[PDB]
Structures are given as structure tokens and as C-alpha cells.
Amino acid sequence: SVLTKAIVNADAEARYLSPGELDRIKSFVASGERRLRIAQTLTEARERIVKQAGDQLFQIRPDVVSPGGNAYGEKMTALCLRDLDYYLRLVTYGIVAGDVTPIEEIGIIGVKEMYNSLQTPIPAVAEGVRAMKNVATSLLSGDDAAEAGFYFDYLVGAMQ
């Protein structure tokens, strides 16, 4: 969280939290109910976001659902959208935590090695992740859509 990241700095210097550190915890926690609402809306529309993300993805790059494609077939496709469902979930976690610690340990550190092994085409995956931003963002107010958008662009960034 902001807490985990920051307290760690306190303990490492053998000290209590600074006025600054205390202030950011206060400003952060004040922004709680809104972040929880952003996660709820997206949790509530998860199946729509994934499915419409999946259509947007295969238009922009179909070849993956074709004879020599990593996602070719009904159960090779059941897995690609499932991975898209995984990342949307992690994005809701990140938004409520206010940073990436959780998103990172769960789904980016090691992701190059995992996908290289599976020879899933990773760079297509970034575009797929990007599509979810477009759908999710259309179910949120301008201000909340931006706040959500940072976490989508992070994942897009980490797969790089």
C-alpha cells in the first residue's frame, strides 16, 4: 500500500513516521470511499469488460485465433480471456491499495519468463490489456476514469 511502502522507510531508518509520512497517510485514506466505488463498479461489470476487451483485441490482432495462433480453439481461447479476467482483478486491487506492490508480486514479476515459456505472444497481450481500459473507462465518471486509468497504463507499462 502507501503504508507498506512508507513504514518500511521508517523501520529501515529506525524511527517513527515523519509529519510528511503521516500527512500522506491522511490524504490517502481520505480518498478511500471513492477508490472503493471505482473497484465496485468495475467488479460489477467484469464479464462485460473482459468479453468486449476480447473482441476489441482480436480485431486489432486476430491471427492469435487462427491455425498457427497461440489462442486458436475454444479452450485455447477460454484461457486468453481468463488471463484478461486475472489482470482486471489485479487492477481493482491496485486501485484500492493506491500502489502496485500487490499487482506486481502477483502478475508482473516473472511474467516475461512465464509467457516466453508458453510462447503466448506477450506484446499482443499488452494491446489486450489496453482494450480493457477503454471498456472500463466508459463505465466511470471522468475523475474516476482517470484514477483507474493510471493502473491500466502501469500494467501496459510493465509488460514491456
Partner: protein, 161 residues
Amino acid sequence: MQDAITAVINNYDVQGKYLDGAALDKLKAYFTTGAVRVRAAAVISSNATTIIKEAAAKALIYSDLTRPGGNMYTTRRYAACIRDMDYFLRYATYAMLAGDPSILDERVLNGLKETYNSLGVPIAATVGGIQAMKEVVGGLVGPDAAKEASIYFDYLSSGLS
């Protein structure tokens, strides 16, 4: 370590669950007490030294502990003991901010019981030093925060006994 916001995420991640209504209710129950935790930490931090002094005075010194044959005899050991006291106070303040005792296990209790057995450090006397600092803390922080600060001192003390 983990905190209330983080614990909710890792507890659900292992089940692969979106945060749902039950999760969202837990997180609210943390956020809604958050401002009070911060104020309480600022009181403890800024009275740190006085809390140790008053806790030692009620529960440690003026005793056989500080006399020859006692474990807090010698300036060396007296210094080590109130050094320890500062750790406890400081970490309990972390646990209370985080709203999770996991840091008290990871960085304070693990192996400490046996460490104290190996050096001869009196456990029961150390617990009284913890429960005296709690007593002082609960006065200084007020109605708002008293119960919440108190529990992590109680976590510490049943961790040794």
C-alpha cells in the same frame, strides 16, 4: 508485513476473488478509523521518552531488578532494557497504524522468547514493562484511540508469555 488494506487483498488473491461486498465492508471499517490512528501515533511518538520513563518507574526500577544480581543492573543492561522498551513502543505504533499485528510477529516476537531465555532476561518483568507503557499510552491518546492502541501492546505481551 501486511496491513488491513493489504491483508484484504492477499486473503482474496489466494482465493482468486474480486473484491466483493464483504471485502469492501472490511476495508471501510479500516478507513473509517484511519484519521484517529494517525493522531494517536503523533501523541505516542512525541511522548515516547516520557512513556518509557513513567512505565519503567511504575514497573521496573526501584527494585531488585536494578540492584546487583538483577538483569537491569549495570548501565549497559539498563540501557539495553529501555532500548528494548523503545522498540516495543515504536512497533506497537506501527501495528496500530497498520491495523494488523503481523509486523509484531515478523520483526519483534519471532525467536524473542528463546533469546530472552538464553540471556536470562526476565520475561514476566518485561511483560509488566509492556502493560505499563499501555496504561500510560491509553491516558495520553484519549477515548478515540485508547482501545485500538491497547490491543497491540496486549498482542506483544501474550506473544512472550
